[PDB]
Design an enzyme around this catalytic site. Structure first.
Site, PDB file in Angstrom:
ATOM      1  N   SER A  87     -22.398   2.872  13.554  1.00 30.82           N
ATOM      2  CA  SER A  87     -23.781   2.924  13.785  1.00 30.82           C
ATOM      3  C   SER A  87     -23.953   3.537  15.252  1.00 30.82           C
ATOM      4  CB  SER A  87     -24.443   1.425  14.086  1.00 30.82           C
ATOM      5  OG  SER A  87     -24.703   0.989  12.950  1.00 30.82           O
ATOM      6  N   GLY A  88     -24.678   4.446  15.311  1.00 30.35           N
ATOM      7  CA  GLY A  88     -25.127   5.431  16.294  1.00 30.35           C
ATOM      8  C   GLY A  88     -24.385   6.338  16.689  1.00 30.35           C
TER       9      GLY A  88
ATOM     10  N   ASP B 211     -35.010   6.019  13.681  1.00 28.97           N
ATOM     11  CA  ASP B 211     -33.637   5.237  14.544  1.00 28.97           C
ATOM     12  C   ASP B 211     -33.057   6.292  15.414  1.00 28.97           C
ATOM     13  OD1 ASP B 211     -31.832   3.282  15.131  1.00 28.97           O
ATOM     14  OD2 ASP B 211     -30.853   3.568  12.919  1.00 28.97           O
TER      15      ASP B 211
ATOM     16  N   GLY C 208     -20.039  -0.640  12.711  1.00 26.17           N
ATOM     17  CA  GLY C 208     -19.369  -0.303  13.671  1.00 26.17           C
ATOM     18  C   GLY C 208     -19.397   1.170  13.938  1.00 26.17           C
TER      19      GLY C 208
ATOM     20  N   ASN D 123      -8.010   4.840  21.741  1.00 28.36           N
ATOM     21  CA  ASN D 123      -7.776   3.441  21.608  1.00 28.36           C
ATOM     22  C   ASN D 123      -8.731   2.380  22.333  1.00 28.36           C
ATOM     23  OD1 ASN D 123      -6.804   0.530  21.651  1.00 28.36           O
ATOM     24  ND2 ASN D 123      -4.788   1.492  20.445  1.00 28.36           N
TER      25      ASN D 123
ATOM     26  N   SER E 103     -19.504   6.239   6.277  1.00 23.25           N
ATOM     27  CA  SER E 103     -19.356   5.401   7.564  1.00 23.25           C
ATOM     28  C   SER E 103     -19.696   4.024   7.154  1.00 23.25           C
ATOM     29  CB  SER E 103     -20.472   6.005   8.470  1.00 23.25           C
ATOM     30  OG  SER E 103     -21.716   6.061   7.822  1.00 23.25           O
TER      31      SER E 103
ATOM     32  N   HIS F  10     -31.233   1.326  16.594  1.00 23.80           N
ATOM     33  CA  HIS F  10     -30.929  -0.237  16.064  1.00 23.80           C
ATOM     34  C   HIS F  10     -29.786  -0.855  16.931  1.00 23.80           C
ATOM     35  CE1 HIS F  10     -28.135   1.448  13.066  1.00 23.80           C
ATOM     36  NE2 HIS F  10     -27.348   0.530  13.505  1.00 23.80           N
TER      37      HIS F  10
HETATM   38 CA    CA Z   1      -8.902   3.305  25.778  1.00 24.69          CA
END
Ligand code: CA
Ligand code: UIR
Length: 223
Positions: free
Chosen positions: A177-178, A84, A175, A54, A172, A40
């Protein structure tokens, strides 16, 4: 990740961020040339970003590498989210180091009650919207298949498992996802779907990676 903690920079070195101008999905490095994620998360023009903490600051350990090829599972069903999983090949090999590391594929499936590490840069609130810029981590156990099927009747296949807490509060979320679910040093799950985030009796659902290892190994050796 809701209810988690700050992992620490590069303490999850197999963790990748998929970027198409912005972070939009997690993924896992499985060797120097290949990333596994959720089907997905499919899109064109993906850049894979390794060694991130970061994601809005260049800190010095990053490698940014465009994808050469993406392969969605041949039986992926977008309506039910069965199968998936997707493979992404890097245009050039990543340089592996303490901060950038691949994660091992499982040799067997994990049992219910097994403790796992889930990580990602997704939303951290179940109610509101708040996206972190550093990597968040959550320890969570695999739930029994009957708790999973009870939460989501008629929706769970043999290629899915649930993990988290039925009481809510830790999960979770958007964002994430995966991204990886790592249990006993092996990649056992991929962040796939859920209902809301950290809601009671609605645990997260993950792609069951131990069902796909043959497909993964055969596909990467042929591409
Ligand atoms: Ca960075
Ligand atoms: N754990 C979870 N509570 C959880 C919720 C939602 C997702 C995923 C997936 C999801 O639930 N839908 C539908 C889709 C996909 C979407 C992509 C990013 C966030 N969504 C993933 C996990």
């Amino acid at each position: 990740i809701v209810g988690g903690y700050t992992c620490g920079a590069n303490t999850v070195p197999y963790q990748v961020s998929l970027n198409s101008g912005y972070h939009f999905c997690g993924g896992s490095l499985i060797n120097s040339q290949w990333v596994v994620s959720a089907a997905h998360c499919y899109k064109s023009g993906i850049q894979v970003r390794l060694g991130e903490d970061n994601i809005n600051v260049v800190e010095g350990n990053e490698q940014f590498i465009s994808a050469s090829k993406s392969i969605v599972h041949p039986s992926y069903n977008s309506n039910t989210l069965n199968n998936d999983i997707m493979l992404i090949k890097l245009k050039s090999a990543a340089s592996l180091n303490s901060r950038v590391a691949s994660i091992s594929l499982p040799t067997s499936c994990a049992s219910a009650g097994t403790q796992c590490l889930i990580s990602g840069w997704g939303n951290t609130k179940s109610s509101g919207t708040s996206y972190p810029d550093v990597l968040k981590c959550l320890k969570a156990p695999i739930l029994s298949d009957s708790s999973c099927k009870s939460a989501y009747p008629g929706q769970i296949t043999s290629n899915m498992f649930c993990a988290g807490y039925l009481e809510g509060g830790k999960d979770s979320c958007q964002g994430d996802s995966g991204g990886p679910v790592v249990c006993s040093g092996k990649l056992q799950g991929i962040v796939s779907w859920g209902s809301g985030c950290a809601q009671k009796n609605k645990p997260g659902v993950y792609t069951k990676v131990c069902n796909y290892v043959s497909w993964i190994k055969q596909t990467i050796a042929s591409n």
